[PDB]
PDB file of C-alpha atoms and ligand atoms in Angstrom:
ATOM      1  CA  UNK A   1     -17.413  -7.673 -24.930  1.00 59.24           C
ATOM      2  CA  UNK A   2     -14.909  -4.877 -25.265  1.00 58.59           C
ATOM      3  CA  UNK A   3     -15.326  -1.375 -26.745  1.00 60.32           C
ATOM      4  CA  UNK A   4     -13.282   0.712 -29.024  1.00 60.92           C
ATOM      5  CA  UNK A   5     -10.271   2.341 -27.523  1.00 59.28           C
ATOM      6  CA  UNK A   6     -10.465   6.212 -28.066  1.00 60.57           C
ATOM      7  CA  UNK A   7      -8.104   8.346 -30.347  1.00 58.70           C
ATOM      8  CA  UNK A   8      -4.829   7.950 -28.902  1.00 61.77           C
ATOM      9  CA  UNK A   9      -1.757   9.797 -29.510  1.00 63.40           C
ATOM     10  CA  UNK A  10       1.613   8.442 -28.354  1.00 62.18           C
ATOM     11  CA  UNK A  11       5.242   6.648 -29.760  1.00 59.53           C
ATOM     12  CA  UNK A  12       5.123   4.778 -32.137  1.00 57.86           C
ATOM     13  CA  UNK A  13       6.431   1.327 -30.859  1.00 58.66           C
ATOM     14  CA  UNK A  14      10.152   0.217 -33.378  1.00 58.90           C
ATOM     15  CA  UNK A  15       9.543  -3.403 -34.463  1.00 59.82           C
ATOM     16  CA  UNK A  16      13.708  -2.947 -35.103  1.00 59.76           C
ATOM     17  CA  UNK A  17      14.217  -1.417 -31.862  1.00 60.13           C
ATOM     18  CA  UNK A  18      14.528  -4.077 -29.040  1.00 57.04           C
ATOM     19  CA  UNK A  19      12.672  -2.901 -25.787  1.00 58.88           C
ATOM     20  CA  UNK A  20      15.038  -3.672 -23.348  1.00 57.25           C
ATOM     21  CA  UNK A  21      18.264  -4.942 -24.118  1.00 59.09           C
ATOM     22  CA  UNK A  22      19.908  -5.484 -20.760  1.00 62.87           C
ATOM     23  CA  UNK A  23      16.857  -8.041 -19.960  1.00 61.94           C
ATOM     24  CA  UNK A  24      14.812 -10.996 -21.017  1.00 61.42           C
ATOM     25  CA  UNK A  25      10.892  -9.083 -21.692  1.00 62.57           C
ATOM     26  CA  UNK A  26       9.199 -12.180 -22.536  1.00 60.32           C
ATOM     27  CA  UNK A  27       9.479 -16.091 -21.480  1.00 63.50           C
ATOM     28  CA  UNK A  28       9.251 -19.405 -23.333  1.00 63.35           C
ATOM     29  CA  UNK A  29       5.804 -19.639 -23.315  1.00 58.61           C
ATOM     30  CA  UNK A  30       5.507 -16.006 -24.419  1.00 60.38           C
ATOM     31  CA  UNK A  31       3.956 -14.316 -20.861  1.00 58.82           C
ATOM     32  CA  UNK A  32       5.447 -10.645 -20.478  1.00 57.03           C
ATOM     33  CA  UNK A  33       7.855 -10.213 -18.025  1.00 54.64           C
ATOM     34  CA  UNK A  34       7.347  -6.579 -16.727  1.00 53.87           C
ATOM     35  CA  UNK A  35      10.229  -4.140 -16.516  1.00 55.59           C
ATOM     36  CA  UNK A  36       9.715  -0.714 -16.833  1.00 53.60           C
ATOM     37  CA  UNK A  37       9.828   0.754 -20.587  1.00 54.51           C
ATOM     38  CA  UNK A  38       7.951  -2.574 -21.794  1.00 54.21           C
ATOM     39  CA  UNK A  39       4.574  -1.260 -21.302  1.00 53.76           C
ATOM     40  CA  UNK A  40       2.335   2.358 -21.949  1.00 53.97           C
ATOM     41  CA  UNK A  41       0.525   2.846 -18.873  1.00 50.37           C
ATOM     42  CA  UNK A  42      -1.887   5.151 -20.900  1.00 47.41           C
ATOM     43  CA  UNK A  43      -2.899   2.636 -23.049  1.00 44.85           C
ATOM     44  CA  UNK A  44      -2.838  -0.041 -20.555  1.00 47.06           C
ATOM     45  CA  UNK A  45      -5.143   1.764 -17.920  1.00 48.16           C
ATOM     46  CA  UNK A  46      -7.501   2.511 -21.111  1.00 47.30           C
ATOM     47  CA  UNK A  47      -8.123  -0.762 -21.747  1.00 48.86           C
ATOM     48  CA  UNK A  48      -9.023  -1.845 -17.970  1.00 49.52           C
ATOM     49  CA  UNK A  49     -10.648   1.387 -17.224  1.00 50.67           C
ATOM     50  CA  UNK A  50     -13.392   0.449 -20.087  1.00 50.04           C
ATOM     51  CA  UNK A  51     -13.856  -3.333 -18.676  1.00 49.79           C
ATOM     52  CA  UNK A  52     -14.477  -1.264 -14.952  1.00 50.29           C
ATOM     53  CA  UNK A  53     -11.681  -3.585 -13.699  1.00 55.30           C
ATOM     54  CA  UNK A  54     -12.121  -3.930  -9.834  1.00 55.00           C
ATOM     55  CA  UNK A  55      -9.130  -5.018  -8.167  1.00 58.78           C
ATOM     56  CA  UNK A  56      -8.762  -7.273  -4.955  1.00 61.30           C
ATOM     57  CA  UNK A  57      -5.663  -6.045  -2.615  1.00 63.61           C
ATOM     58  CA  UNK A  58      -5.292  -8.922   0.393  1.00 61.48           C
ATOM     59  CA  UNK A  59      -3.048  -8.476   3.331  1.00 61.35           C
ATOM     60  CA  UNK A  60      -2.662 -11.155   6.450  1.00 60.02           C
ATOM     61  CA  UNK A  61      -1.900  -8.546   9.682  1.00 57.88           C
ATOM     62  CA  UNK A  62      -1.109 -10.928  12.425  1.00 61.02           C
ATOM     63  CA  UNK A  63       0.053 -10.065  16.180  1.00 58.64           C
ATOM     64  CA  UNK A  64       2.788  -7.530  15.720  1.00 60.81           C
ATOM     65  CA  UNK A  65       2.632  -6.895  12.261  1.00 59.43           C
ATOM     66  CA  UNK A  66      -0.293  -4.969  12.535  1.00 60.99           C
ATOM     67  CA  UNK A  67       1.861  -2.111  12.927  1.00 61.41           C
ATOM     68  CA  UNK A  68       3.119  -2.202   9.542  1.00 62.50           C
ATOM     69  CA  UNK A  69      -0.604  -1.623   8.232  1.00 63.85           C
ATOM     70  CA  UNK A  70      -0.958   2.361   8.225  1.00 60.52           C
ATOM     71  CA  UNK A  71       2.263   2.751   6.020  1.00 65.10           C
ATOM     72  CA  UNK A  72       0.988  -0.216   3.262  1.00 65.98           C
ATOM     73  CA  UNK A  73      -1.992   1.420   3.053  1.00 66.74           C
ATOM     74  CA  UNK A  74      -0.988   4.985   2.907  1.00 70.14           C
ATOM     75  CA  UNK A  75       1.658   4.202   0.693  1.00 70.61           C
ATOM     76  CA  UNK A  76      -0.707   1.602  -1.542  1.00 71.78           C
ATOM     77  CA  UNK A  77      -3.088   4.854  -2.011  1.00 72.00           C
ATOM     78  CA  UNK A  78      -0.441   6.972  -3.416  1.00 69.24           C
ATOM     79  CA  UNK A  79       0.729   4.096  -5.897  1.00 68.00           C
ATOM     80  CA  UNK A  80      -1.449   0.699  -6.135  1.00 67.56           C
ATOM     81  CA  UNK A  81      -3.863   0.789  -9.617  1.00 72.00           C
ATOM     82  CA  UNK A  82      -4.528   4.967  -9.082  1.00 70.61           C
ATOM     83  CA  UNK A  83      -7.746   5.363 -10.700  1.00 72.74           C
ATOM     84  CA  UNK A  84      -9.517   1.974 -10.960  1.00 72.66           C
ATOM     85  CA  UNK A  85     -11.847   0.431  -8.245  1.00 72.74           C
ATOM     86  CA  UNK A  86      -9.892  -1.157  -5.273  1.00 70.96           C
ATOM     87  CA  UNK A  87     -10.840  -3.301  -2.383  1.00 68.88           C
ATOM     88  CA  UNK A  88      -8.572  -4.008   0.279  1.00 68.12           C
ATOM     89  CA  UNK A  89      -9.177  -7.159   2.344  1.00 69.78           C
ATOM     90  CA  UNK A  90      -7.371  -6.930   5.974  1.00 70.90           C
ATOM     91  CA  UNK A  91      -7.014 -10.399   7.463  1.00 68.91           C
ATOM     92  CA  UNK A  92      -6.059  -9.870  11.025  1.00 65.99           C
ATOM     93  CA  UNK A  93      -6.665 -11.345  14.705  1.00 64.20           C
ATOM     94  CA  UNK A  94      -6.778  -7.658  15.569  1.00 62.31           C
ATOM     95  CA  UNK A  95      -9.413  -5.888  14.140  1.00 59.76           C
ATOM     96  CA  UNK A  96      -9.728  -2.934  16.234  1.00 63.00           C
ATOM     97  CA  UNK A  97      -6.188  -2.505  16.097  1.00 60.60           C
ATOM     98  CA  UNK A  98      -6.645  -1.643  11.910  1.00 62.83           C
ATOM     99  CA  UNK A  99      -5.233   1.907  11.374  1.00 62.24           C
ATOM    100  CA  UNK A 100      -8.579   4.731  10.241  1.00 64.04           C
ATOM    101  CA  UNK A 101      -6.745   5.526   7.047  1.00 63.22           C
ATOM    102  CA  UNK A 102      -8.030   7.801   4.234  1.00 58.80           C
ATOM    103  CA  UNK A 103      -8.673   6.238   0.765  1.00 59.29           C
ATOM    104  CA  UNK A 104      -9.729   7.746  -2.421  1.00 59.23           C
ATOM    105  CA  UNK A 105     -12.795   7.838  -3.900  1.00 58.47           C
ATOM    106  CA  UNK A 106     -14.031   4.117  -5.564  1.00 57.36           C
ATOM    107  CA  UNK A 107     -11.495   2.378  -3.294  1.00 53.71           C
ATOM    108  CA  UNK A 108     -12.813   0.511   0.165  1.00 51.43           C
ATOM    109  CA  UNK A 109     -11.513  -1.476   2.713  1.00 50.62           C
ATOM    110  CA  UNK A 110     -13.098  -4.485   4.842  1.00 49.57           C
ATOM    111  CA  UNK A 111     -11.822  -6.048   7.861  1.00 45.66           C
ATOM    112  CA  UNK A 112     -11.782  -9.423   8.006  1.00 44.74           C
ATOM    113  CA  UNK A 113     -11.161 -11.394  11.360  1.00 47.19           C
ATOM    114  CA  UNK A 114      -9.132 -14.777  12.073  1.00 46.80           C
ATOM    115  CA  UNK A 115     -14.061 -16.872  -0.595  1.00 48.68           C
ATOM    116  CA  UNK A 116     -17.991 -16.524  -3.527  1.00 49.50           C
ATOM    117  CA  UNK A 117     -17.348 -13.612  -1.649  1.00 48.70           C
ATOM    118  CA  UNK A 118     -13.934 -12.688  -3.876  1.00 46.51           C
ATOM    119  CA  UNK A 119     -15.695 -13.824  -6.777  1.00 48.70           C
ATOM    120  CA  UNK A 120     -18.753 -11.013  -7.064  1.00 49.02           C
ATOM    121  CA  UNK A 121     -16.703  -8.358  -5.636  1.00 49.82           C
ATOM    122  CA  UNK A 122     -13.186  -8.546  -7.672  1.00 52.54           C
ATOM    123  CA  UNK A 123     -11.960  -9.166 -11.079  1.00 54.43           C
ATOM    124  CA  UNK A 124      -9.035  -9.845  -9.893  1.00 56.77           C
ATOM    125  CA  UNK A 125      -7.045 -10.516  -6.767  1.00 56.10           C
ATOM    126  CA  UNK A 126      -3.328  -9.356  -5.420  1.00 55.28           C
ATOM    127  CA  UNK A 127      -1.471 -11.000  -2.772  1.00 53.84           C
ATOM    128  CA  UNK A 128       1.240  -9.405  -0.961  1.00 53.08           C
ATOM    129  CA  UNK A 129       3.026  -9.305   2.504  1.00 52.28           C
ATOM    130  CA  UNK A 130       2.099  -6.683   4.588  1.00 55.58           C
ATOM    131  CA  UNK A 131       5.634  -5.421   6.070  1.00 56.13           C
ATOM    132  CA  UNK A 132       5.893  -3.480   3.178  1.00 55.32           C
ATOM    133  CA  UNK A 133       5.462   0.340   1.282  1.00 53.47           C
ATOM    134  CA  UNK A 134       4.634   1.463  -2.224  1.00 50.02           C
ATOM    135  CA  UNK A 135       7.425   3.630  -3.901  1.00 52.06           C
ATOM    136  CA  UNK A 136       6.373   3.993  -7.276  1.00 49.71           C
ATOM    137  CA  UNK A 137       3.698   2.785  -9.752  1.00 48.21           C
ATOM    138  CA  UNK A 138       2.321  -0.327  -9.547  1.00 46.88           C
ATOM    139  CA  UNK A 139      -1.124  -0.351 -12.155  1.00 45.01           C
ATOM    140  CA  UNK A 140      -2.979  -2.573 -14.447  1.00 45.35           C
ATOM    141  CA  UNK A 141       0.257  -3.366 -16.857  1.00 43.35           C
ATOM    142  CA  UNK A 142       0.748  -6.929 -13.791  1.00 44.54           C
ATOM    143  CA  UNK A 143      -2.873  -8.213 -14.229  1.00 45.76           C
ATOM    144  CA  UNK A 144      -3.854 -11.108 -16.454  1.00 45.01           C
ATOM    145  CA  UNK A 145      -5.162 -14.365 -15.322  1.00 47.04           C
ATOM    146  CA  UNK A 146      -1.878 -15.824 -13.232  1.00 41.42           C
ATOM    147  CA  UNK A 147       0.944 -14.167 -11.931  1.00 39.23           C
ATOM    148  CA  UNK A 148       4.313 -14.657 -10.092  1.00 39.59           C
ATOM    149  CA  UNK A 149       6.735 -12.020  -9.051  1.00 41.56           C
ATOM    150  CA  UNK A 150      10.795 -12.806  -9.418  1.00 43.42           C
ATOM    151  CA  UNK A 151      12.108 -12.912  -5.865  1.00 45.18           C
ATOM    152  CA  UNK A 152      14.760 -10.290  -5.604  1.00 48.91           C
ATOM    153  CA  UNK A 153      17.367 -12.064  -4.607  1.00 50.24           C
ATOM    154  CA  UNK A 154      17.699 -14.670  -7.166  1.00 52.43           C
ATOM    155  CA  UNK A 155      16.410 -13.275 -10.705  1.00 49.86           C
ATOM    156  CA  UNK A 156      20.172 -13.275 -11.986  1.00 48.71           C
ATOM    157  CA  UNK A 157      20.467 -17.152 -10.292  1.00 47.62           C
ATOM    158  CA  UNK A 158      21.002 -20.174 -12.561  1.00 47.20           C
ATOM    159  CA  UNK A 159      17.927 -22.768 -11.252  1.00 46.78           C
ATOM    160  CA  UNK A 160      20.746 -24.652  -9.405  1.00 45.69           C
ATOM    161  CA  UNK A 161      21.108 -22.005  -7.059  1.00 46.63           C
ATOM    162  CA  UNK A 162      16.991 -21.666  -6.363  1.00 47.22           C
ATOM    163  CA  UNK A 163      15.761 -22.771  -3.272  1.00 44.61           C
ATOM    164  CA  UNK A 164      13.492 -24.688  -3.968  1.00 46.81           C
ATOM    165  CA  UNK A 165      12.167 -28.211  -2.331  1.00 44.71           C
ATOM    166  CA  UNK A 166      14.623 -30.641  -3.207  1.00 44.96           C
ATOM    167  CA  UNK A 167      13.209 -33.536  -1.057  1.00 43.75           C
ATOM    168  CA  UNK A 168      11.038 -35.918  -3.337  1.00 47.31           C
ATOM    169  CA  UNK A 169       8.925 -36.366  -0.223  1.00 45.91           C
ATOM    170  CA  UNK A 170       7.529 -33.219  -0.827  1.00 47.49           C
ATOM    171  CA  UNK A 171       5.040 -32.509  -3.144  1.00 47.45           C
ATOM    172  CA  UNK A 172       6.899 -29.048  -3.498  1.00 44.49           C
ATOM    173  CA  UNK A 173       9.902 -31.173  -4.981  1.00 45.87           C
ATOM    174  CA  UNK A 174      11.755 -29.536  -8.103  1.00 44.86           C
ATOM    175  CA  UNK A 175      14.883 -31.225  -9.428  1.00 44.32           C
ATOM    176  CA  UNK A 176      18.071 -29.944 -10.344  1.00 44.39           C
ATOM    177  CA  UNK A 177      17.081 -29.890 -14.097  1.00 46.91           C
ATOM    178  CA  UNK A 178      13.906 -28.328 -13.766  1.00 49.23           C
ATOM    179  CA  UNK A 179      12.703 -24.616 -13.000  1.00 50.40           C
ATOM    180  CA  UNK A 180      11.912 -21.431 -14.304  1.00 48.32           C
ATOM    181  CA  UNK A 181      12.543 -18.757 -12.411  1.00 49.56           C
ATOM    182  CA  UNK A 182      12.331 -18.802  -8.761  1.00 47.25           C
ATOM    183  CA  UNK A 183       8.933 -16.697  -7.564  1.00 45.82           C
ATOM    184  CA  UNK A 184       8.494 -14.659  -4.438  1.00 48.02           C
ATOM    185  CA  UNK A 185       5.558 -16.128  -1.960  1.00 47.73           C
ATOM    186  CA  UNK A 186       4.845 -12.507  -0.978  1.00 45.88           C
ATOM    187  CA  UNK A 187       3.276 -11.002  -4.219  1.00 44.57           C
ATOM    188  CA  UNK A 188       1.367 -13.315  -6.369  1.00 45.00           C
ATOM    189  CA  UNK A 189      -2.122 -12.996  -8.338  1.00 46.57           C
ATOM    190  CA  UNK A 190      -4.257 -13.295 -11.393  1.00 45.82           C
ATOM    191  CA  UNK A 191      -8.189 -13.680 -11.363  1.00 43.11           C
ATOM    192  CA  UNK A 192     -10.218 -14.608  -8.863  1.00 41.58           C
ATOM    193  CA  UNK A 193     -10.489 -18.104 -10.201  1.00 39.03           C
ATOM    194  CA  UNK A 194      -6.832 -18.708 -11.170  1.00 38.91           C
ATOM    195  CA  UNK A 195      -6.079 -17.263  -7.485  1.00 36.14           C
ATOM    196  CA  UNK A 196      -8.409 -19.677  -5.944  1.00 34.84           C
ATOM    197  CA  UNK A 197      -7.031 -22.485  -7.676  1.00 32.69           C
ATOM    198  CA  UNK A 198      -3.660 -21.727  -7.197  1.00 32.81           C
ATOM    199  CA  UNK A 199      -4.720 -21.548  -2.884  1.00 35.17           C
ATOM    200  CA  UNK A 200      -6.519 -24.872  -3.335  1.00 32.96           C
ATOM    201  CA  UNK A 201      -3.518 -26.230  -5.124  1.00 31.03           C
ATOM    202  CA  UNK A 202      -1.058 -25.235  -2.410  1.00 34.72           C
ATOM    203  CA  UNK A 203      -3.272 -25.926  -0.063  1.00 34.53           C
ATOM    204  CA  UNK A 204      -3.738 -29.258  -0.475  1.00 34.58           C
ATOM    205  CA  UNK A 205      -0.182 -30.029  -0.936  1.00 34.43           C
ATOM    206  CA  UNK A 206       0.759 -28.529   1.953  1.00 37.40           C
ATOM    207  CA  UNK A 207      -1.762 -31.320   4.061  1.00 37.36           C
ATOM    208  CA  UNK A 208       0.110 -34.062   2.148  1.00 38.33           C
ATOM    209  CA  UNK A 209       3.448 -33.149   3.167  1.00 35.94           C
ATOM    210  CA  UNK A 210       2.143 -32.598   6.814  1.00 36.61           C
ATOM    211  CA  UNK A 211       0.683 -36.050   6.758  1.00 38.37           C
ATOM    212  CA  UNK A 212       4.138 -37.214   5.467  1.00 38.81           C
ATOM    213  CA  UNK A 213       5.822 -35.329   8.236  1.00 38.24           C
ATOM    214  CA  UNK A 214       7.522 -33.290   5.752  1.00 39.30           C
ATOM    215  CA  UNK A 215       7.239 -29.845   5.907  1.00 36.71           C
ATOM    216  CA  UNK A 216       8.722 -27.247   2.313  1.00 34.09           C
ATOM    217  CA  UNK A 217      11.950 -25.437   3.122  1.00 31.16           C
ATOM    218  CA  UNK A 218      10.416 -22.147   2.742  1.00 32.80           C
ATOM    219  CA  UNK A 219       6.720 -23.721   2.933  1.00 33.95           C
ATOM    220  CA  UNK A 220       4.195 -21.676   1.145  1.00 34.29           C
ATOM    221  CA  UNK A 221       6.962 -20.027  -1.139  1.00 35.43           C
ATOM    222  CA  UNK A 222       7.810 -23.720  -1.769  1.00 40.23           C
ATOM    223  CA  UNK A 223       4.527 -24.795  -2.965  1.00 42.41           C
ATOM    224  CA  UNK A 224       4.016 -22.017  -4.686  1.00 38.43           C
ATOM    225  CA  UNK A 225       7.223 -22.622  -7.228  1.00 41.58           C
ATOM    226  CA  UNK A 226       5.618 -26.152  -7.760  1.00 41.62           C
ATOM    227  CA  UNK A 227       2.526 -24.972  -8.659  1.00 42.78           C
ATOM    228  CA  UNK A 228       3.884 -21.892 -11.053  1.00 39.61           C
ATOM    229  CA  UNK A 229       6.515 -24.564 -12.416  1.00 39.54           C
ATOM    230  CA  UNK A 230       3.363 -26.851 -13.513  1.00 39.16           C
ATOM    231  CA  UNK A 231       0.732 -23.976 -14.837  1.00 36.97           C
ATOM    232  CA  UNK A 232       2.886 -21.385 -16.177  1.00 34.83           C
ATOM    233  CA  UNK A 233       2.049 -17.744 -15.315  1.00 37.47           C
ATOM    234  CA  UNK A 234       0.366 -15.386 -17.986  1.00 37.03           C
ATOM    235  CA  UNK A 235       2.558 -12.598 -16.661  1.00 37.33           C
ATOM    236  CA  UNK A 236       5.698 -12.558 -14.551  1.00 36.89           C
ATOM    237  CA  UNK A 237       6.609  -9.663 -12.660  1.00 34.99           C
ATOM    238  CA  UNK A 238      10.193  -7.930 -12.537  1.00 34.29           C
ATOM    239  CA  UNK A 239      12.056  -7.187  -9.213  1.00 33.22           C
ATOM    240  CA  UNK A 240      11.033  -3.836  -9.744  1.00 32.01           C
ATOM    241  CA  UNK A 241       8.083  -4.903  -7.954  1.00 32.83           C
ATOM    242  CA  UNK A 242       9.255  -6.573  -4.682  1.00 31.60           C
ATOM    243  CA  UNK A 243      12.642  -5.137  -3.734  1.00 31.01           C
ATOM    244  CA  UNK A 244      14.733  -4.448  -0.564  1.00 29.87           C
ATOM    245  CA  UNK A 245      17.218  -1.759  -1.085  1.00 31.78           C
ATOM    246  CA  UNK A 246      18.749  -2.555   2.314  1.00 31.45           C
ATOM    247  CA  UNK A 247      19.636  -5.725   1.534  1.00 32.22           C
ATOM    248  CA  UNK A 248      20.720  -5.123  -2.638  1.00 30.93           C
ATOM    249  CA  UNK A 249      21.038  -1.830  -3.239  1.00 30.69           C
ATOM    250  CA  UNK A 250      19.085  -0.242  -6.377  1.00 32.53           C
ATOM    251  CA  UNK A 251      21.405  -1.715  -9.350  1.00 35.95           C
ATOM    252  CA  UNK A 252      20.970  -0.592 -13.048  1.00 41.79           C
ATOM    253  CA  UNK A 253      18.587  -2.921 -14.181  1.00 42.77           C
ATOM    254  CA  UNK A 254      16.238  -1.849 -12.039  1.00 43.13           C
ATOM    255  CA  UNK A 255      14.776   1.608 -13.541  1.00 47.23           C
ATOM    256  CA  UNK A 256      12.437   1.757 -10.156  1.00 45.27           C
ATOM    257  CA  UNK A 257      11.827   0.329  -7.262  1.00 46.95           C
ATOM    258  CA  UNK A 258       7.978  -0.266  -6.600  1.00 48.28           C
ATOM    259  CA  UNK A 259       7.048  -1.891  -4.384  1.00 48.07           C
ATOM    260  CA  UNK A 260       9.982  -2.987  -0.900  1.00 47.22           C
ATOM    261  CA  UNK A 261      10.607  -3.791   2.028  1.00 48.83           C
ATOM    262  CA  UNK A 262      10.520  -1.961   5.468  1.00 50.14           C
ATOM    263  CA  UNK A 263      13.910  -1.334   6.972  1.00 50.84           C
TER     264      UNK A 263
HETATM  265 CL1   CL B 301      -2.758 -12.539   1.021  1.00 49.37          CL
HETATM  266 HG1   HG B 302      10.116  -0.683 -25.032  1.00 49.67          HG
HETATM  267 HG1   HG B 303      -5.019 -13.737  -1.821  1.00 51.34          HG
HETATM  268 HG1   HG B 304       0.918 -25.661  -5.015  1.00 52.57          HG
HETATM  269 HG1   HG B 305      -0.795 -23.213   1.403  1.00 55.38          HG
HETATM  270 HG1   HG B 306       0.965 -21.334  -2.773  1.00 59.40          HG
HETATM  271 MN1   MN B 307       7.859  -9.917   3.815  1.00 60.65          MN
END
């Protein structure tokens, strides 16, 4: 089971004192949506320290984008989950090509050409894009069993506006009527098993449509709304955590930008 938490000394949270009141914190089916000031990283990384949480950190690093590896790494060592156990997984069809780059202690790196495997060696797995850099803290307050990650450039959008599948050929199709938010393809996770499922889910779908001759507007992406419309995530993440300041700026709402893009 779980242990005790220590003696702890810190703010008390104001039951009359909304949390944020420029933002929705919570959804429907009451999963946090993260924003910074909802969460105490103290007693957050307390809780997942005494569980020896091990976190999974997977990357694709095909042809040219290989060269965007030393920066996501460097960058993920200065900011991705700081003092728990990290493995990074490197998919790429250049192995030799992987930038040597120094990683702190109880974090480790493996090189994987171009799943059991994910199972015994993580608690949980994180899924991002690769042409990318750490800017600030990004720690235990995202995991829980499923997660999405509000794409950047439509959190403020009414579901109208989202682009998702709107073929019914598709098995990505979402109506006009439906839809929650509209989720990023490049930073997704949860556990190992809610990953995996999620993958096999997608995966699958993605054959059908191929059979069809149909192929999702933004594929993956597109597959992925489905599947996050049907099994709701435990946890969605804020745009603080998959921004590009080239393209929108840094607006108010957005107390820090995490996690964005490479100019
Ligand atoms: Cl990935
Ligand atoms: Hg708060
Ligand atoms: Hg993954
Ligand atoms: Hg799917
Ligand atoms: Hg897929
Ligand atoms: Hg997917
Ligand atoms: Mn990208």
């Amino acid at each position: 089971f779980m242990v005790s938490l220590p003696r702890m000394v810190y703010p008390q949270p104001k039951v009359l004192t909304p949390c944020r009141k420029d933002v929705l914190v919570v959804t429907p089916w009451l999963a946090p949506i993260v924003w910074e000031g909802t969460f105490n990283i103290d007693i957050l990384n307390e809780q997942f320290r005494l569980q020896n949480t091990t976190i999974g950190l997977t990357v694709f690093a095909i042809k040219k984008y290989v060269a965007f590896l030393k920066l996501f790494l460097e960058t993920a060592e200065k900011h991705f989950m700081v003092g728990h156990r990290v493995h990074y997984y490197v998919f790429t069809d250049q192995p030799a090509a992987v930038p040597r780059v120094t990683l702190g202690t109880g974090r480790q790196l493996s090189v994987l050409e171009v799943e059991r495997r994910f199972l015994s060696e993580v608690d949980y797995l994180v899924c991002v894009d690769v042409d990318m850099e750490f800017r600030d803290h990004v720690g235990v307050e995202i995991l829980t069993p499923l997660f999405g990650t509000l794409h950047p450039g439509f959190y403020g959008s009414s579901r109208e506006a989202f682009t998702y599948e709107r073929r019914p050929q598709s098995q990505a199709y979402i109506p006009k009527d439906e839809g929650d938010f509209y989720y990023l393809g490049g930073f997704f996770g949860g556990s190992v098993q809610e990953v995996q499922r999620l993958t096999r889910a997608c995966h699958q779908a993605m054959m059908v449509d191929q059979a069809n001759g149909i192929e999702a507007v933004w594929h993956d992406e597109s597959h992925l709304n489905k599947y996050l419309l049907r099994h709701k995530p435990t946890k969605v993440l804020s745009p603080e955590y998959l921004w590009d300041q080239q393209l929108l700026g840094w607006p108010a709402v957005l107390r820090k930008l995490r996690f964005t893009a490479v100019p």
